[PDB]
Amino acid sequence: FVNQHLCGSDLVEALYLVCGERGXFYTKPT
Amino acid sequence: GIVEQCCTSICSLYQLENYCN
C-alpha cells in the first residue's frame, strides 16, 4: 500500500480512489 | 490538518478511510 508522505495532491488522490466522497473532487475528467 | 501526518508522518489507507468515514 502507500504509507509515505503523500501530502495533499497525493493524500487527496488516495482520498478519491478511497472514499471519493461517493462521487469525485475534480482533477482530470478526460 | 491531514498533511500533518499524511505528509509529515505516514498516511495509511485506513487513516484516510477515517478522513471520509
Curated annotation (Swiss-Prot), chain A:
Residue span relative to the full protein: 25 to 54 of 110
The organism's place on the tree of life at top rank: Eukaryota
Gene designation: INS
Protein name per UniProt: Insulin B chain
Effect of substituting residue 22 to Q: In MODY10; reduces binding affinity to INSR; reduces biological activity; reduces folding properties
